[PDB]
Amino acid sequence: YLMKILTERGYSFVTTAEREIVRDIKEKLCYVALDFENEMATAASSSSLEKSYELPDGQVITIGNERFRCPETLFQPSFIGMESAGIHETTYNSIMKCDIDIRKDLYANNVLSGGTTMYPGIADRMQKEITALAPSTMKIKIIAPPERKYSVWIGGSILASLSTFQQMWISKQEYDEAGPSIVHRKCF
Amino acid sequence: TTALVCDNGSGLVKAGFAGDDAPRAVFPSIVGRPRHQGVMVGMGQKDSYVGDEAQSKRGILTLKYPIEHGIITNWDDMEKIWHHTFYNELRVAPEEHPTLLTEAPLNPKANREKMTQIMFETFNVPAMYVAIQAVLSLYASGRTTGIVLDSGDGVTHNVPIYEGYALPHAIMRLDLAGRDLTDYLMKILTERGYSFVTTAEREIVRDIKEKLCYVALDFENEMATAASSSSLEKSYELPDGQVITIGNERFRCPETLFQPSFIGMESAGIHETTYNSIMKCDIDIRKDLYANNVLSGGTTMYPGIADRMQKEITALAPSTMKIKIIAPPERKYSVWIGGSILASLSTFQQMWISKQEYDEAGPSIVHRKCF
Amino acid sequence: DFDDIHRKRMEKDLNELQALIEAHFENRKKEEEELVSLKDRIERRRAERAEQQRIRNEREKERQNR
Amino acid sequence: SDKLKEAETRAEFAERSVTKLEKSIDDLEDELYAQKLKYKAISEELDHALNDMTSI
Amino acid sequence: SDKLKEAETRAEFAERSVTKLEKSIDDLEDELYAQKLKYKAISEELDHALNDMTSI
Ligand SMILES: Nc1ncnc2c1ncn2[C@@H]1O[C@H](COP(=O)(O)OP(=O)(O)O)[C@@H](O)[C@H]1O
Ligand SMILES: [Mg+2]
């Protein structure tokens, strides 16, 4: 989507190699707006947002309100034509499917992970959205550790280092006896 | 040594050493196995949380009471509850302490015999004695006569006693109690939009019933008032927010006690089974029973029941007799206080069922002279 | 029997009420006024912190502005 | 050049974020104090009531 | 190199400030919410007392 909206200024990236350049632009410049309409209004009047970036050959480019419009797709998947609701509302729906007595704990211990949750300013936008959706009494807290990108792998290391886990591996003789369908069995 | 005054009950197990004022440990009697799968390894997840521990993890458990209506329907769970009560809530090994269980009137024999067999074989107590739950509540009031209505959570029974001589032909046991009121409240809450279905949410409905419901002095006037004004609508905050507003469901839930036709039961209310229990007694002790009507049990804690019941009985009874309803503030633990008093008596010290006696006659000893 | 009801009721009928009134009085006195005074004190310290933050932020923005 | 651009940019984001955090902190603290003072006023209402109850 | 060193140090200081501010905010939030629940409970028991007075 960023590669598609950059074409509104004149920069055309098409080759599968230039997708990497657009990815670098997204990583280094884009950020999630706290309030979308106010940012759209501000970027359309002033010019305090236009940040420039140097391509791998020169010819610097200037990104205007494409900065916070690219990652806004997360909270409004209608931008890329997807029907579903944003990541701010699928979390609330996932909570509401849970039982009525563990909703407070889930509200208080919302965890972020994965690479794409590294946008500057997402841990505040998501908290604001959920606080808008959730009942006013519950406390909404969003855990955003600085080591977000490698969180899954750190957890994997911890799990593999446990003594209690040492007998859950799928030993080779077990695979030889039941075939590849062993993974769906007790050894999950 | 000291005696253990346990009181199984149905809904709250109350226990403590004999000779005190209040039970040492009071906790719901529920045993809930987890129902989901569980992915964290080494979390130390047990296979069954009993007692007050399962009222905190109830979000992922399936709580199930081991005592339905006085009788015990699931003996393994009841054994687990007793083991927890002895070892973790009191921390006294049962090998060195007599026990005094309590049992509702008119219960199946096999229940009592199995109870004594468990207490003598598994826990291996020195001596145990089973007492009727109403005589103790009469002990606690310091009376010696009177007709006691012990409306627990499992079963409501009404034992009349005069001068210490119980009248076995006048016991009126009715199976409407707090649990049926919880179910009926959960069923009438659906008329506003709030649906509670899970066995965990039954606890939430029970809390609503305890904190909000009250017994109306006159039913029709309250139904008319709640349908015009809005001075009754009291709100309550669920365990996650989304406050709810209870309208005329407040006094309609406990009204089932006086009109058991609401939940489809045929019998007459607790206001008329007491009068019937009195009228079965002899003609010369009816005045004393009229004057010493005793209330006990948890479910008789509704705000405003000691006046509604008195009004109803005064309507039924002859105009000359004086109707008085004893409602001590310590109603909930009245049975256990009476149990402590009875276990602390010197005259009672030779009525225990000693273990050698059980070894000679088997579990059927309980029906014999040692009652 | 029925003669210990006096000696277990009349006692707490007055002693318990008086003792609980004493407890409420002492707890209110200890709690409410001290809490309001301490919150006012912390508010004044917070305002002073706000002034220090404003001064430092302004001087650093003045120097660093290039 | 890339390093220092990154550092200054993320630092500016940090400064704006932390200032927003400070506004949040002050608002929360002051609201807490206001609520606590309302509670203590209620407590002194109850304490006047208890002084009446000194009737017992 | 000089600009890089100064920028990095400024960044790290601001970052640690950010973390500490978040922790303080969390703790004050827990206490304020506990006070809020206390207030709701006191008001509710007060109303129950009022209804008890209505009864008697
Ligand atoms: N304060 C209260 N107000 C209204 N109902 C209550 C109150 N306390 C307990 N109950 C009801 O009484 C039941 C507890 O009764 P209890 O006397 O413990 O039964 P048991 O005879 O088995 O011990 C609870 O299930 C609840 O429904
Ligand atoms: Mg009972």
UniProtKB/Swiss-Prot annotation, chain A:
Cellular compartments annotated: Cytoplasm, Cytoskeleton
GO cellular component: actin filament; cell body; filopodium; glutamatergic synapse; I band; lamellipodium; synapse
UniProt keyword annotation of Zinc present: no
GO biological process: actin-myosin filament sliding; actomyosin structure organization; cardiac muscle contraction; cardiac muscle tissue morphogenesis; cardiac myofibril assembly; cytoplasmic actin-based contraction involved in cell motility; mesenchyme migration; negative regulation of apoptotic process
One function term, GO molecular function aspect: microfilament motor activity
Keyword Iron: no
Keyword tags: Acetylation, ATP-binding, Cytoplasm, Cytoskeleton, Hydrolase, Methylation, Muscle protein, Nucleotide-binding, Oxidation
Post-translational modification comment from the UniProt entry: MICAL1 and MICAL2 produce the (R)-S-oxide form. The (R)-S-oxide form is reverted by MSRB1 and MSRB2, which promotes actin repolymerization.
Domain of life: Eukaryota
Chief location of this protein within or outside the cell: cytoplasm
Similarity annotation: Belongs to the actin family.
Functional description taken from the UniProt entry: Actins are highly conserved proteins that are involved in various types of cell motility and are ubiquitously expressed in all eukaryotic cells.
Subunit structure: Polymerization of globular actin (G-actin) leads to a structural filament (F-actin) in the form of a two-stranded helix. Each actin can bind to 4 others.
Remarks, miscellaneous: In vertebrates 3 main groups of actin isoforms, alpha, beta and gamma have been identified. The alpha actins are found in muscle tissues and are a major constituent of the contractile apparatus. The beta and gamma actins coexist in most cell types as components of the cytoskeleton and as mediators of internal cell motility.
Protein's name in the database: Actin, alpha cardiac muscle 1
Organism placement in taxonomy: Eukaryota, Metazoa, Chordata, Craniata, Vertebrata
Gene symbol of the encoding locus: Actc1
From Swiss-Prot, chain B:
Enzyme category, top tier: hydrolase
Keywords on record: Acetylation, ATP-binding, Cytoplasm, Cytoskeleton, Hydrolase, Methylation, Muscle protein, Nucleotide-binding, Oxidation
Gene3D superfamilies the record matches: 3.30.420.40, Actin, Chain A, domain 4
UniProt-listed SUPFAM superfamilies: Actin-like ATPase domain
Coiled-coil stretches noted in the UniProt entry, renumbered to this chain: none
Residues modified as N6-methyllysine: K80
Subcellular location: Cytoplasm, Cytoskeleton
Molecular function in Gene Ontology: ATP binding; hydrolase activity; microfilament motor activity; myosin binding
EC number assigned by the record: 3.6.4.-
Record's catalysed reaction(s): ATP + H2O = ADP + phosphate + H(+)
One of the record's GO cellular component terms: synapse
Residue positions, PTM Tele-methylhistidine: H69
Modified how: Oxidation of Met-40 and Met-43 by MICALs (MICAL1, MICAL2 or MICAL3) to form methionine sulfoxide promotes actin filament depolymerization. MICAL1 and MICAL2 produce the (R)-S-oxide form. The (R)-S-oxide form is reverted by MSRB1 and MSRB2, which promotes actin repolymerization.
Subunit structure: Polymerization of globular actin (G-actin) leads to a structural filament (F-actin) in the form of a two-stranded helix. Each actin can bind to 4 others.
Other facts noted in the record for this chain: In vertebrates 3 main groups of actin isoforms, alpha, beta and gamma have been identified. The alpha actins are found in muscle tissues and are a major constituent of the contractile apparatus. The beta and gamma actins coexist in most cell types as components of the cytoskeleton and as mediators of internal cell motility.
Family: Belongs to the actin family.
Full protein name: Actin, alpha cardiac muscle 1
Highest classification ranks of the organism: Eukaryota, Metazoa, Chordata, Craniata, Vertebrata
From Swiss-Prot, chains D, E:
Function statement: Binds to actin filaments in muscle and non-muscle cells. Plays a central role, in association with the troponin complex, in the calcium dependent regulation of vertebrate striated muscle contraction. Smooth muscle contraction is regulated by interaction with caldesmon. In non-muscle cells is implicated in stabilizing cytoskeleton actin filaments.
Modified-residue entries (Phosphotyrosine), positions: Y33
Protein name as it appears in the record: Tropomyosin alpha-1 chain
Domain comment as written in the entry: The molecule is in a coiled coil structure that is formed by 2 polypeptide chains. The sequence exhibits a prominent seven-residues periodicity.
Phosphoserine modified-residue sites: S24, S43, S55
Similarity section: Belongs to the tropomyosin family.
Modification(s) after translation: Phosphorylated at Ser-55 by DAPK1 in response to oxidative stress and this phosphorylation enhances stress fiber formation in endothelial cells.
Inducing or repressing factors: Induced in stimulated quiescent cells.
Compartments in which it is found: Cytoplasm, Cytoskeleton
Additional comment: The sequences of cardiac and skeletal muscles are identical.
Subunit architecture: Homodimer. Heterodimer of an alpha (TPM1, TPM3 or TPM4) and a beta (TPM2) chain. Interacts with HRG (via the HRR domain); the interaction contributes to the antiangiogenic properties of the histidine/proline-rich region (HRR) of HRG. Interacts (via N-terminus) with LMOD2 (via N-terminus) and TMOD1 (via N-terminus).
Organism superkingdom: Eukaryota
Species this chain originates from: Mus musculus
Gene that encodes it: Tpm1
